[PDB]
Design a binder for this molecule. Structure first.
Ligand SMILES: CC1(C)CC[C@]2(C(=O)O)[C@H](O)C[C@]3(C)C(=CC[C@@H]4[C@@]5(C)CC[C@H](O)[C@@](C)(CO)[C@@H]5CC[C@]43C)[C@@H]2C1
Lengths: 254, 250
């Protein structure tokens, strides 16, 4: 029944709101001209960066990004438990689903905080220029550019948070993940999520032909962001042996 | 209108049949569904191979020969896809150039099971195990088998694969495209036709459309990882003025 799919949509949307403090809706309200009830401070060069510390180098911008990632992971983890059936899966598979799904999700949601020109930071208080990031030294000025390229095409799908809630759930419950003990219960859950997403996209974007297929295709764009990111980390780990990574993040990488 | 989608679906199936000699229906018959009338010669070891200038290289090289054949058959097929020839010529070239690898692994799944791949005409069969028994070359075919095993579990037939292949060609995110709009316009139409096809041809296979699209992510990095050992091979085969005309064809 349609009815059951809508109810799952609603449930997932409700949990999404509860798990993620900075929604796409809030982020698009900050980025635009809109509703300057609170506009961001902007980082476009290094001494506006010094001014930034005051009302809100290549290393700490990275270490800072590392922080928002580990906190993002803990948030995605909270959301996953809300996915029906998820906590009932074998514990090893829960861990495995989180290991591989977490970065694909981080870059899906990061797009919400991005436009062509830059990215919101510190829960929206801040905004860091794409150009400033691209100008960073040696192995760091490279990190954010492919995320920006993805975000610009992903953002043109014009998804809202209730669409994203279901898409994110679909991503966590893959089944094609390396080392899954128990693939069939995982796929039963995903088929359910896919039915739900499909209905949601059709109802929320009736004029948008084949948005479902176009959104699913976007998943290969995510895969290769992760891939580039991972190998880039391996470089930095060698050029700066004094710089430390976060164990939680480290455990995620294999 | 469901009529035009169905019309499009039949068109591609017909075109697919004329462009590709060895169909999936045919290859399945020959394979382990055993059609036992003319058994294919089997290659399981070095001496059955010989019974078929350096073994491991020359297998990988024979692998290039048929892919070059495949490219031309795919090229012909693409030209039958409604709207394709009306596209900008550079865009047509671009679409084939970036799509042809994904199509090749896709169709190659049709010639594969968990134990090996139909070789040549289908008059041959090379065991998976003889293939992993190799140099740097032992890891060439294994990721294709792994993909094929999952892909084949979807139990698509030729009528399904016909539209799927068309969707792959008309992507729209290929680098260097000049006019993305008519390409996506066509792929949208192809995606609708594929959806209808799967619902009629597999009415009890839930969310098969989505799962098939999910496979495209598997194809792309299969391709991406393949180009990465495609050319550890230039770390291997290097200097000799014997193939420069042959070097050219590939
Ligand atoms: C044994 C040898 C030398 C001649 C016969 C045979 C065969 O299987 O029919 C053909 O040349 C086909 C390919 C190339 C062959 C083996 C695997 C390749 C292979 C699967 C090798 C991997 C390549 O990436 C692709 C997929 C082409 O991209 C090709 C497609 C064509 C076939 C099936 C065979 C090579």
């Amino acid at each position: 029944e349609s009815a059951d799919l809508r109810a799952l949509a609603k449930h997932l949307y409700d949990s999404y709101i509860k798990s993620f403090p900075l929604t796409k809706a809030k982020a698009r309200a900050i980025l635009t001209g809109k509703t300057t009830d609170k506009s961001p401070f902007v980082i476009y060069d290094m001494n506006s960066l010094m001014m930034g510390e005051d009302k809100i180098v290549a290393i700490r911008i990275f270490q800072g990004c590392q922080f928002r990632s580990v906190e993002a992971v803990q948030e995605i983890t909270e959301y996953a438990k809300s996915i029906p059936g998820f906590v009932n899966l074998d514990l090893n598979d829960q861990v495995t689903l989180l290991k591989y799904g977490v970065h694909e999700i981080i870059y899906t949601m990061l797009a919400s905080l991005m436009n062509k020109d830059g990215v919101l930071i510190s829960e929206g208080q801040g905004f860091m220029t794409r150009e400033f990031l691209k100008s960073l030294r040696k192995p760091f000025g490279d990190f954010m550019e492919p995320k920006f390229e993805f975000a610009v095409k992903f953002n043109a799908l014009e998804l809202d948070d209730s669409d994203l809630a279901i898409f994110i759930a679909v991503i966590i419950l893959s089944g094609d993940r390396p080392g899954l003990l128990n693939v069939k219960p995982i796929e039963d859950i995903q088929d359910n999520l896919l039915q739900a997403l499909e209905l949601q996209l059709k109802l929320n974007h009736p004029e948008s032909s084949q948005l479902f297929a176009k959104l699913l295709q976007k998943m290969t764009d995510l895969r290769q962001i992760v891939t580039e990111h991972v190998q880039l980390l391996q470089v930095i780990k060698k050029t700066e042996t004094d710089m430390s990574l976060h164990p939680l993040l480290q455990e995620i990488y294999k």
